[PDB]
Paper text:
NR2E3 is an orphan nuclear receptor that is highly expressed in photoreceptor cells and plays pivotal roles in photoreceptor development, differentiation, and survival. In concert with other transcription factors, NR2E3 has a dual role to consolidate the rod fate of rod precursor cells: NR2E3 is associated with the promoters of both cone-specific genes, including the cone opsin genes, to repress their transcription, and rod-specific genes, including rhodopsin, to activate their transcription. NR2E3-null mutations cause retinal degeneration and lack of color vision in mice, whereas various point mutations have been associated with enhanced S-cone syndrome (ESCS). In this study, we solved the crystal structure of an apo-NR2E3 LBD, which reveals an auto-repressed dimeric conformation that is required for NR2E3 repressor functions.
We thus designed an expression construct of NR2E3(217-410), which lacks the N-terminal region that corresponds to the flexible loop in TR4, as a fusion protein with a non-cleavable N-terminal MBP tag and a C-terminal non-cleavable His6 tag. As it is in our case, we readily crystallized the MBP-NR2E3 fusion protein in the P2 12 12 space group and solved its structure at a resolution of 2.8 Å by using the MBP and TR4 structures as the molecular replacement models. Each monomer consists of a canonical antiparallel three-layer α-helical sandwich fold comprising 8 alpha helices (H3-5, H7-H10, and AF2), with a disordered region between helix 5 and helix 7. The dimer interface is a parallel coiled-coil formed by the helices 10 of both monomers. Instead, the C-terminal part of helix 10 bends and collapses into the space that corresponds to the ligand binding pocket in other NR. This space is filled with hydrophobic and aromatic residues (W257, F261, I381, I386, F390 and F391) whose bulky side chains protrude into the cavity and, in this conformation, do not provide enough space to allow ligand binding. The kink in helix 10 and the subsequent collapse of the binding pocket of NR2E3 allows the AF2 helix, which follows helix 10, to bind in the cofactor binding site of the LBD. Hydrophobic interactions stabilize the AF2 binding in this position, with residues M400, L403, L404 and M407 in the AF2 helix forming Van-der-Waals interactions with residues from helix 3 and 4. As a result of the occupation of the cofactor-binding site, the AF2 helix would block the binding of either a coactivator or a co-repressor to the LBD and would therefore be expected to inhibit the receptor’s activity. Single mutations of L372 and L375 to arginine reduced NR2E3 repression ability by >50%, and the double mutant L372R/L375R retained only 20-30% of the activity of the wild-type receptor.
Residue numbers in the entry:
A (entry chain B): 331 to 372, 1215 to 1282, 1289 to 1410
B (entry chain A): 5 to 372, 1215 to 1281, 1293 to 1410
Amino acid sequence: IMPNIPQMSAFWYAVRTAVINAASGRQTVDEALKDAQTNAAAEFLDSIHETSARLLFMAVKWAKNLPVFSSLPFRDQVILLEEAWSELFLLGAIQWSLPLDSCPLLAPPEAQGRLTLASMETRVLQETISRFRALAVDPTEFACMKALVLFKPETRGLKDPEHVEALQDQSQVMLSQHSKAHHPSQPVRFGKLLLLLPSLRFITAERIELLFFRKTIGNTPMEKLLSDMFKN
Amino acid sequence: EEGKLVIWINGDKGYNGLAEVGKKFEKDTGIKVTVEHPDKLEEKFPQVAATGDGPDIIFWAHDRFGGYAQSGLLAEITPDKAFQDKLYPFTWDAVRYNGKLIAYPIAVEALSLIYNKDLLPNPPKTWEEIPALDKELKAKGKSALMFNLQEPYFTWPLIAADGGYAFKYENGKYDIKDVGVDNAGAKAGLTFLVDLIKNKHMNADTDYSIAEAAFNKGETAMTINGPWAWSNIDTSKVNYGVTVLPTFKGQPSKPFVGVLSAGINAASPNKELAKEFLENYLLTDEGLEAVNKDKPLGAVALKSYEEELAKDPRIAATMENAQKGEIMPNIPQMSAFWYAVRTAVINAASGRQTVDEALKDAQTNAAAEFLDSIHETSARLLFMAVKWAKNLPVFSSLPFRDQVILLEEAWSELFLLGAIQWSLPLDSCPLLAPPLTLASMETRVLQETISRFRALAVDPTEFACMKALVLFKPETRGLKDPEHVEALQDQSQVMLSQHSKAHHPSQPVRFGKLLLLLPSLRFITAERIELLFFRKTIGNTPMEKLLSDMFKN
């Protein structure tokens, strides 16, 4: 029988990530149930995590508030958001936990109630955040990088890619203009910022869905958010 | 399984005409004969047989029978000298291996000269007289010659004509080291080929489909094709004919001979049954005829029945052309060769380079032992990566462990850059699959990223810098002197823009663009990349293996 309780979600939400990660290779049989054990039990902070939809929703709100975005073909808008949700989410998350010193998912020192992220995940997630913290990555620099990640011309299906190219190039000028103005001392800082972009892909979008988002029937978190924005 | 025999033969063959021969056998021996035509036949066999299962006898091109014999997958057949004489002596040299017969030849095939009797009642005997021949026909709104120039298989006959050859066939076997693609008579035939297009007598863009239609309608006088294209011209009905390929500097054209042979499974308990079936039933006028009926086999390796099909001039031609050709080497080193000539031919033809340079390049590629499979070639891409990294003076000056850590942590990106650069010029090297799945959606992305590097016109100095940007990651965990790494990355960055604004002063954002390619190097995980372009490892990394290999050598 299913316990009629609110704190029982983490049940499968831990096992799922466990059975999938085990049946993948980046985690052996035993190296999986332990995490699920300290995860399932770790109910404390799992509701608010799945409620990291406000972050993604904040990524769409930001984009939709950009006039240059809202001047693209409708489909182009949908396409760019669908293809970049993962990285817009990460950039959001990285900026969220930037001023922090702890988290709702610690892992290696000496993790009660909190989501015990996998090995390579935490290792990379923690590390990538540090790089951003080690730089003075300020609010506008984040806005620029969001833009750089959104306005990808190569993206297939774009009805007006030449224009998406124009906007991305304009974002470089924004980021470079800002970067060099606030840090004349750091000569190669513009690049260093762009060299942070690949880390947004270290962990695939599928895994981002499986780790920080609630179930979504066949559709990506971004699709679900756009769909339920039009049912209205 | 032990008192009956199971056969495997492809669907484009008289597989129903074979069961008519197998049923009579079952009627006179009580030995059940089941004929099967599985899809991945040529690829399934090396699986079921590799261990202990599959058919007793397998039909297929002789070429493939080389890999099998090497893997002890094929039994040594043992025909009497009295039987060996019933088949053309040259056919045996197609099913040989280490001096041991490993299959029974049954049907020969080779490119012939097909022409239109209505338009051209007398085909040229030589190539030299083809140019001035196109002029005459061009007036009456037609064309002289049209054949698929895309595949090296179709253009080799001419290139080989004056001395060209794949691998030297000395004492019973081949010599992978000796390759005759950049010979005297090699540049001779290729040059001539490039001229035909260089004078608008042909098109460097003519493929198979185009040539078939061009001829089958009457828009061309001649073409170069096989016995498979024959019945496809009977759907339409241009009065055609099949004759010997034109000669070059007096020397005949040397097409590739493909022999449909039948080898016996090495793990078959019916080696004598299979043998009896192939010698006293199949390889006989009556035996072969039953299969020819279902679907023609063109010229057959069996004299008796061949001289009965010689009546057909079309077939007579095929056997005639085949005899003047060279047997296709069964060695696995034929993949390297196919790729080299492929590149060389499409190149000189497209003007992407001269004739001599295309052959000089195809020369090494064929003798290259790292072009035989996607794995071997990828292993090479990665080794050049490390070799590259070690050649950087600033690199050797780094804490040994730092060098190891750097290479292991960025092997995927370092390989991808290497593969991408390597495949910028050419249009196909280590990914194409179709003649929906995951390995198909990734291919799309991986070909998409190559387009991006092409559109941006990334030169070697930019690839060198980008590789450095990918190698010198100062955030990598474990590094002993991370500050030095930061400096090197920073330098590479400066050198990269300095070079970018220098070779493209008009594009003020080029630098940014080049760094915006780096993420694509991570779109496909290192794990996947490994399961795609690389071989066996088990809880290891191609770099980790490569480095460990250099440690224990």
